[PDB]
Amino acid sequence: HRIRITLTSRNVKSLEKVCADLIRGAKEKNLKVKGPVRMPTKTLRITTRKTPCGEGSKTWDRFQMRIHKRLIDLHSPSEIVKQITSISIEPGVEVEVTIA
Amino acid sequence: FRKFTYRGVDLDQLLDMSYEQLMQLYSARQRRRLSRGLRRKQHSLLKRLRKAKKEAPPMEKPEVVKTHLRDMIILPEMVGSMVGVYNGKTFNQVEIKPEMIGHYLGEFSITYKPVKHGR
Amino acid sequence: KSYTTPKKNKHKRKKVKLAVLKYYKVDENGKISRLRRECPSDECGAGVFMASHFDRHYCGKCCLTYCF
Amino acid sequence: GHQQLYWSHPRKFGQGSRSCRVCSNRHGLIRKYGLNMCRQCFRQYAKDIGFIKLD
Amino acid sequence: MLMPKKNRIAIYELLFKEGVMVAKKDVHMPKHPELADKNVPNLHVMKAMQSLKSRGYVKEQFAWRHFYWYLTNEGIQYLRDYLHLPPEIVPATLRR
Amino acid sequence: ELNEFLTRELAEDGYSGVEVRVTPTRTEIIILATRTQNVLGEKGRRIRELTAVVQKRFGFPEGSVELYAEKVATRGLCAIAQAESLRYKLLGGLAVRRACYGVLRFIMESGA
Amino acid sequence: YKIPDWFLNRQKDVKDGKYSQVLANGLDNKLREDLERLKKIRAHRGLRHFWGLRVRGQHTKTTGRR
RNA sequence: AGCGUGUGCCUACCCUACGCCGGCAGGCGCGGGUAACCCGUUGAACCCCAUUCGUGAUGGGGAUCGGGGAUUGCAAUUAUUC
RNA sequence: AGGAGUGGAGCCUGCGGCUUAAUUUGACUCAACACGGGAAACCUCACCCGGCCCGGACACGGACAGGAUUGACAGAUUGAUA
Numbered sequence: 112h113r114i115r116i117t118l119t120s121r122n123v124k125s126l127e128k129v130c131a132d133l134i135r136g137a138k139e140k141n142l143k144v145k146g147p148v149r150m151p152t153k154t155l156r157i158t159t160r161k162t163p164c165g166e167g168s169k170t171w172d173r174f175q176m177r178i179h180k181r182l183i184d185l186h187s188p189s190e191i192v193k194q195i196t197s198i199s200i201e202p203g204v205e206v207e208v209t210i211a
Numbered sequence: 212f213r214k215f216t217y218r219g220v221d222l223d224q225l226l227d228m229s230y231e232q233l234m235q236l237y238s239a240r241q242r243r244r245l246s247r248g249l250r251r252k253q254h255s256l257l258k259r260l261r262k263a264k265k266e267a268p269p270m271e272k273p274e275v276v277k278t279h280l281r282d283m284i285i286l287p288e289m290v291g292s293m294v295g296v297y298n299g300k301t302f303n304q305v306e307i308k309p310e311m312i313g314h315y316l317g318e319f320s321i322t323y324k325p326v327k328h329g330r
Numbered sequence: 331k332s333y334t335t336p337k338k339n340k341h342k343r344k345k346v347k348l349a350v351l352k353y354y355k356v357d358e359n360g361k362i363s364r365l366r367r368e369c370p371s372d373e374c375g376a377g378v379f380m381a382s383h384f385d386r387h388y389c390g391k392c393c394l395t396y397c398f
Numbered sequence: 399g400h401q402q403l404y405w406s407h408p409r410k411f412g413q414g415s416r417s418c419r420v421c422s423n424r425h426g427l428i429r430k431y432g433l434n435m436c437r438q439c440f441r442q443y444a445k446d447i448g449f450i451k452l453d
Numbered sequence: 454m455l456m457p458k459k460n461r462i463a464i465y466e467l468l469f470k471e472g473v474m475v476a477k478k479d480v481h482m483p484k485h486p487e488l489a490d491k492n493v494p495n496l497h498v499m500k501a502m503q504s505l506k507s508r509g510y511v512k513e514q515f516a517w518r519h520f521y522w523y524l525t526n527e528g529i530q531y532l533r534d535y536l537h538l539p540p541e542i543v544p545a546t547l548r549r
Numbered sequence: 550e551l552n553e554f555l556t557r558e559l560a561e562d563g564y565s566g567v568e569v570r571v572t573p574t575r576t577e578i579i580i581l582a583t584r585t586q587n588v589l590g591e592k593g594r595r596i597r598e599l600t601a602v603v604q605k606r607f608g609f610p611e612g613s614v615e616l617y618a619e620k621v622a623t624r625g626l627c628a629i630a631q632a633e634s635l636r637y638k639l640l641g642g643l644a645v646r647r648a649c650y651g652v653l654r655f656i657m658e659s660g661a
Numbered sequence: 662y663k664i665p666d667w668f669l670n671r672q673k674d675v676k677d678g679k680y681s682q683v684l685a686n687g688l689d690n691k692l693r694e695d696l697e698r699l700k701k702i703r704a705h706r707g708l709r710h711f712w713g714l715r716v717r718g719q720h721t722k723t724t725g726r727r
Numbered sequence: 728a729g730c731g732u733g734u735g736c737c738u739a740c741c742c743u744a745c746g747c748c749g750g751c752a753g754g755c756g757c758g759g760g761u762a763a764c765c766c767g768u769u770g771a772a773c774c775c776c777a778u779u780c781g782u783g784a785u786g787g788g789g790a791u792c793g794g795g796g797a798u799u800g801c802a803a804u805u806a807u808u809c
Numbered sequence: 810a811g812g813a814g815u816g817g818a819g820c821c822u823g824c825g826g827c828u829u830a831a832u833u834u835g836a837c838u839c840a841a842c843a844c845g846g847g848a849a850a851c852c853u854c855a856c857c858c859g860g861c862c863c864g865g866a867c868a869c870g871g872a873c874a875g876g877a878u879u880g881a882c883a884g885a886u887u888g889a890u891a
Contacts, residue, residue: 121448151763156731157428157449159437165845166836172441174449180763202570219678238673239796240803252801253406256889279859279888282802282850297888300830300858310702318705318804325712326828338860348875388882395882399881400862403891405481407852408801410739414852419736420517422478424853426846432735437846446552454864455879473598475605477737480864486737487605496864507867516554518737521602546597608736667750672795680795688793695793705805710792717792718806724790724820 114192115209118147118181125203130181136195137185145184153178217287217312225287225312233286237313241284257283264289277302281317296320353379369394454500462536463491464501468511468524469532472546474502476520551603555580558599561637562587565621565630576614578603581621583630588618625659 116133120126130147137144155176160169185192189210196208217225218236225233234242250257260283263276277295290309295302296316303320311319355363367380371392380396381388387396409415413424418436426437433440433447440447467488468474476485482495502522505511510528514521524532524544533540552567563583570577580599582588589596600616603609624630631652638648666672666680671691673680675698683691699707709716715725 148763154731155431155449157430157433157440157444159428159441160844160846161441162845163438163441164835165847166841167844168840169844169846172444172451173453174440174444175452176447176449197573202568205571216676216678218673218675238794240806243797244802247801250801253889254801259889277888281804295888298830298858302888308702310698311704314702314704315804319703320804321705321708322805323832324829328827330827343878345872345877350876383883386883390881393880393882397883400891403861403889409481409852411800412852413849414854415740416738422518429735430732434736434738443553454866457879471601471605472594473601473605475602479737482737500864500866503866509867514554514558516557517550519554519606521554521558521606523598546594546601549593549597665750667796670794674794683794692793709805715791716806718804719791719820720822723822726819 112186112188113211114185114187114189116183116185116192116196117207117209118183118204119207120179120204121177122203123179125201126179126181129200129204129206130183132199133183133195136198137183137187140187140191140195142191143186147181147183150180150182152180215309217309222287222290222309228287241313244284256280264292267291272306275302275304278316281315281320281322283316285311285314285316287312298322367396454497454504456497456501460491460493460497461501463488463493464498465532465536468502468505468522468528469536469538469544472524472544474498474522474524476502476522478515478518478520551578551607554602554606555599559588560633563621563624563630564588564633565624565627574613576609577617578614579617579619581619583621583624583627585618585620623659625656626661631656 118126118130118133120129134144134147155178157174158171159174161167161172162170187195192208196206200206214221216222220228220236225236228236230245234246257280260276260278260280266276267273273291273293275293275295277297279297281296285307287309290307290312292307294305294307294316296305296319298320299322305316305319307316353364353366355365357363364379366382367387368376369378369380369389369392371378371389371394373392374389378389378391380394381390386398388394413427416427416429416434417424418427418439419434420439420443421436423436428435428437428440435443440449444450464474474487476495476498478499480496480499485493485495485498488498499520502511502520503513505522505528506513510525510531512523512525514523524546529544532538551569555567556564559580559582565581565583568579568581570579580588590598596616596618600612600614603614603616604611607614621627621630635648635652638651639645643651669680669682670688671681671683696707696710700711701707706716715721719725
């Protein structure tokens with residue numbers, strides 16, 4: 112009954128659109144919803160030399176890859192969540208539904 | 212002159228002694244080396260040097276048994292044997308007097324030629 | 331380019347024409363006199379024969395040895 | 399036998415064990431986050447993986 | 454490459470029954486990750502399939518470290534002629 | 550690795566990229582390319598070859614990955630479509646100057 | 662007087678097998694003997710001592726420069 | 728304090744609390760964490776406070792070198808590292 | 810205008826030279842010299858001294874099922890239960 116949706120995405124606006132649709136999907140069906148908890152975004156970092164050889168001035172590229180995690184708690188029966196979460200997802204976002 | 216000993220132990224006392232008891236006598240590197248377990252890989256070439264160990268012919272100096280093994284321990288069991296330590300190029304004829312115990316056969320070989328300086 | 335030592339050759343296989351006749355002895359009647367020992371290993375039942383060397387017996391693929 | 403010598407030297411650790419998953423070469427490896435991918439390959443495929451230059 | 458004949462038959466059965474076969478460029482791989490229980494090394498798969506390639510029965514594409522072998526119409530006829538298969542049955546890429 | 554493999558395989562077939570949707574039970578992987586009829590093969594032979602490849606390589610289960618091969622709308626503004634276009638014009642034996650003006654003229658008239 | 666064996670400058674000696682602190686005139690004698698032992702056996706370590714070089718595995722290219 | 732990292736595809740190899748043995752390096756049990764969940768409230772150094780020292784190559788400096796003890800590994804000698 | 814230095818000392822390290830079986834090698838003003846993500850015990854490794862294997866597709870002509878070829882414990886031999 113306490114069902115915990117984990118929205119993890121690389122993009123923010125796709126993740127904010129999905130978590131906004133899951134608040135509208137929880138408000139229209141009138142089930143009690145703990146708000147989307149913004150988790151601390153993880154910046155995956157790789158700093159390589161630019162040069163494929165060793166013969167320039169030592170320039171470095173610094174590749175970030177931000178991963179944003181939200182999570183939403185619902186007071187909802189199982190099959191109601193199975194219907195909600197299966198509708199209108201966009202491929203940037205990864206959705207993991209925890210039953211209990 | 213006097214009867215040489217390792218740590219505080221006579222050579223025949225060293226020689227009729229188990230590996231487990233011989234461990235507690237020499238330095239910690241050689242304890243580690245021989246405690247890891249008996250040697251079954253291409254380290255059963257160590258076990259094949261045990262066969263070359265058990266091939267001392269009657270009364271003279273024995274013939275040279277050659278080794279591409281520089282990580283081999285000079286056991287008291289080995290002492291008296293004539294060994295050819297491989298430099299990578301040449302087998303150096305090395306006898307092992309009983310004060311070599313603990314050390315490795317490879318270190319005794321020069322491996323690298325000494326370096327005089329032209330200019 | 332030119333090297334010092336003379337070359338090493340490969341082992342040439344000493345191939346035998348009709349090597350099957352040696353393993354058996356034909357009788358005057360329709361029977362046999364099997365010369366060389368049959369392999370007692372589990373892999374090969376009673377079909378595979380052992381080697382008959384000068385001072386011991388040996389089988390090839392199961393790699394089984396019997397000294398006198 | 400030859401099968402007892404062909405691959406008998408251990409490949410359990412060191413930069414003679416792991417290699418680039420593209421180049422197949424043994425140098426400048428990005429092991430971080432299980433890329434297992436040499437630094438010139440990563441610099442080619444960064445965009446395709448999701449790595450972006452911002453700051 | 455000299456192989457046990459049972460291996461080469463197992464490889465050609467697997468190349469036929471599915472319309473494609475893949476493999477990693479790894480000579481030092483004792484078991485092919487698909488054709489596992491029939492104990493084939495990976496180098497026997499590579500060298501069987503590049504023998505199929507040479508005489509123009511299979512098509513070669515190589516990505517990162519993975520060989521990909523598409524079986525072509527001459528290869529279809531060669532394998533059904535080789536393994537003694539019925540011409541009724543098709544590889545899994547000609548069936549919709 | 551998907552995008553590299555599909556570049557090396559479907560280059561001459563007018564390749565333009567991938568889009569993979571990781572859905573529950575299925576992988577809705579969509580090849581976006583110019584000639585859909587060239588990539589799909591003969592009655593979807595080369596569709597099913599590529600599904601069987603991706604299945605056997607990446608370790609996806611039996612038919613839990615299925616490929617589509619959709620069409621590039623206004624292919625004059627796709628960069629790698631006009632790169633491979635220019636590539637197979639030069640490799641075909643056409644002169645460098647004529648080919649380059651030919652691509653440049655097309656992508657301008659395309660509305661870039 | 663209960664000073665442990667882990668605390669002495671000659672632990673598990675090669676000739677007598679005894680844990681003992683060795684002091685000034687004895688230490689100079691025992692250092693001479695340790696170099697003389699490695700010398701006579703013709704070990705790589707004793708040979709590097711004989712040649713007046715770095716023995717504990719340094720690079721002699723740029724340092725040791727007297 | 729603040730950035731991070733942390734159990735892998737092939738790939739073995741993670742970060743570690745807590746309890747015992749050992750001076751120490753370290754060992755043996757058992758836990759937690761695939762992570763704002765555990766290590767972690769990251770009890771970091773400099774700094775801060777109180778002893779000893781006393782212008783001396785000195786308790787500055789820690790090179791070189793002897794002897795010993797542990798760990799990683801298939802293997803350390805040309806001293807792996809501690 | 811100054812601050813902390815570097816250049817002097819020791820050591821770590823890279824380069825030239827010397828040496829060596831080999832001391833693998835690229836780069837030499839800024840824009841070579843803790844740079845090749847290059848902290849190499851093995852692997853890496855390209856260098857040196859030895860010894861295995863074919864992983865020489867396919868096509869053609871011979872050898873060949875009256876067997877073309879695979880592999881193989883001893884004892885030698887070797888570094889090796891190559």
